[PDB]
Design an enzyme around this catalytic site. Structure first.
Site, PDB file in Angstrom:
ATOM      1  N   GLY A 181       0.809  -1.204   0.000  1.00 16.25           N
ATOM      2  CA  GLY A 181       0.000   0.000   0.000  1.00 16.25           C
ATOM      3  C   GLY A 181       0.845   1.258   0.000  1.00 16.25           C
ATOM      4  O   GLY A 181       0.757   2.067   0.924  1.00 16.25           O
ATOM      5  N   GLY A 182       1.664   1.421  -1.035  1.00 11.72           N
ATOM      6  CA  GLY A 182       2.497   2.605  -1.158  1.00 11.72           C
ATOM      7  C   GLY A 182       3.569   2.668  -0.088  1.00 11.72           C
ATOM      8  O   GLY A 182       4.711   2.259  -0.308  1.00 11.72           O
ATOM      9  N   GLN A 183       3.189   3.193   1.072  1.00 10.76           N
ATOM     10  CA  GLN A 183       4.087   3.368   2.205  1.00 10.76           C
ATOM     11  C   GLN A 183       3.261   4.061   3.285  1.00 10.76           C
ATOM     12  O   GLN A 183       3.656   5.108   3.808  1.00 10.76           O
ATOM     13  CB  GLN A 183       5.295   4.227   1.810  1.00 10.76           C
ATOM     14  N   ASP A 184       2.086   3.489   3.550  1.00 10.68           N
ATOM     15  CA  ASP A 184       1.102   4.015   4.502  1.00 10.68           C
ATOM     16  C   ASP A 184       0.765   5.487   4.248  1.00 10.68           C
ATOM     17  O   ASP A 184       0.760   5.929   3.096  1.00 10.68           O
ATOM     18  CB  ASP A 184       1.537   3.755   5.960  1.00 10.68           C
ATOM     19  N   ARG A 233      11.235   2.752   5.641  1.00  8.91           N
ATOM     20  CA  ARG A 233      12.657   2.982   5.413  1.00  8.91           C
ATOM     21  C   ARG A 233      13.506   2.384   6.528  1.00  8.91           C
ATOM     22  O   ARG A 233      14.440   1.627   6.264  1.00  8.91           O
ATOM     23  CB  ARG A 233      12.947   4.478   5.276  1.00  8.91           C
TER      24      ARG A 233
END
Ligand code: GDP
Ligand code: MG
Length: 164
Positions: free
Chosen positions: A52-55, A62
């Site tokens: 999902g993208g990166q929340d 990272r």
């Protein structure tokens, strides 16, 4: 130690875990929607999650990629409807330095499934037939029985520790 077993929704993550048995999974709700299952206990440490993208834009991903040394990619070989959903996430894991050598463990379970792409195009619509040079590994994975899991975990462990 930490290996980010990445995979879509209902791929097989909870099953693999059901075998390993790292203790009841604490499935909390960090960010409105983004849930992470810190299945990390003892020698094994799996920061479970979904795509999902990166929340809602948070540097937690990272910090995971940075400290993590593992890489278990569980590809719902069957889900032929959203197929590229992985490629979409992977998009970032392309150039990313933090995870260079990290052996991508392509657990291709759910191949023998009638819905999934035919036998041959199984390793087609995936892009893993042409994509080379990248550190990876793919064997027939049967989570139900337990097959596939052994060769995968062992190979990964050895490779990472040995490569350096
Ligand atoms: N028929 C069959 N079902 C599978 C396979 N492996 C696991 N599943 C089932 O699919 C469902 C989703 O898997 P789950 O572990 O909960 O996935 P996660 O949501 O991605 O953590 C569960 O009901 C599993 O028992 C398989 O290859 N064959
Ligand atoms: Mg879950």
């Amino acid at each position: 130690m930490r290996i980010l077993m990445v995979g879509l929704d209902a791929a097989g993550k909870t099953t693999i875990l059901y075998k390993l048995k790292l203790g009841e999974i604490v499935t909390t709700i960090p960010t409105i929607g983004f849930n992470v299952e810190t299945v990390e206990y003892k020698n094994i440490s799996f920061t479970v999650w979904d795509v999902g993208g990166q929340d809602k834009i948070r540097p937690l991903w990272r910090h995971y990629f940075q400290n993590t040394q593992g890489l278990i990619f569980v590809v719902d070989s069957n889900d032929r409807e959203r197929v590229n959903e992985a490629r979409e996430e992977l998009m970032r894991m392309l150039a990313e330095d933090e995870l260079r050598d990290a052996v991508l463990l392509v657990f291709a379970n759910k191949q023998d499934l009638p819905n999934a792409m035919n036998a041959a195009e199984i390793t087609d619509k995936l892009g893993l037939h042409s994509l080379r040079h990248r550190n990876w590994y793919i064997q027939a994975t049967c989570a139900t029985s337990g097959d596939g899991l052994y060769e995968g975990l062992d190979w990964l462990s050895n490779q990472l520790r040995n490569q350096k």
